[PDB]
């Protein structure tokens, strides 16, 4: 029913609001708060492996909030333990990239990182300007859609509840929850007087998201293959656990 979709949206909306690290309006307010050239050069002087470790810390902190986001979605908690893990392994970073759009300046192509808005040049030492460019591209694209917090919440829940992840056990139950989340997202988008082409634009973004996470995975696994002791000893346990 319509009431059931409204309740579902409220559950997911409140879970998101409770588990976002920063208020949307606060992030949007301080886009003028940018790294100075001296600060940029400081990051650029870091060796590749050190810059990566710093970035993994930030990613992992974001992921801890996403784990809590998932835990407060009633439909997610109803799933078996195996499927919860499978979904979070495959989907947590996707949610992080969606959440990035809340902390992105689409006009100036900057992202809120380590306390200030950073250009791609901040990430120079990672040695993968193509990947970084792709990340900023996704951010700029999503951030320019001006999604509300509730729309971001439902879109986040939608990608997390992907019934097509490998190794899932309760495929049917997850499919049901995902379909209902998508109907709720459609409803909210319409209510906010979005054109009907809004949702199909978002669905297209899902492919981009998986490609992004795909790159991150292959980069990390290559790093682990050459530098196994660095990964084992210096990267966050949750990070190693989710992605390696």
């Amino acid at each position: 029913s319509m009431a059931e979709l409204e309740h579902l949206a409220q559950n997911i909306s409140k879970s998101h609001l409770e588990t976002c690290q920063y208020l949307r309006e606060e992030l949007q307010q301080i886009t003028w708060q940018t790294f100075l050239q001296e600060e940029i050069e400081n990051y650029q002087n870091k060796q590749r492996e050190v810059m990566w470790q710093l970035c993994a810390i930030k990613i992992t902190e974001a992921i801890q909030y996403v784990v809590e986001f998932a835990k407060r979605i009633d439909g997610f908690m109803e799933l078996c333990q195996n499927d919860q893990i499978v979904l979070l392994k495959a989907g947590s970073l996707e949610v992080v990239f969606i959440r990035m759009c809340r902390a992105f300046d689409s006009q100036n192509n900057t992202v809120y990182f380590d306390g200030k808005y950073a250009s791609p040049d901040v990430f120079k030492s990672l040695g993968c300007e193509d990947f970084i460019s792709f990340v900023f591209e996704f951010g700029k694209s999503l951030c320019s859609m001006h999604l509300t917090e509730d729309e971001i919440a439902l879109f986040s829940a939608f990608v997390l509840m992907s019934a097509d992840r490998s190794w899932l056990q309760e495929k049917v139950k997850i499919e049901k929850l995902q379909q209902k989340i998508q109907l709720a997202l459609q409803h909210v988008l319409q209510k906010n007087h979005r054109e009907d082409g809004i949702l199909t634009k978002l669905i297209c973004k899902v492919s981009t998201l998986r490609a992004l996470c795909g790159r991150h995975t292959e980069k990390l696994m290559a790093f682990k293959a050459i530098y196994p002791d660095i990964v084992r000893l210096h990267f966050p346990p949750l990070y190693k656990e989710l992605f390696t």
Partner: peptide
Amino acid sequence: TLLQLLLGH
């Protein structure tokens, strides 16, 4: 494991 812990499994 750590994920299992955080999920309360």
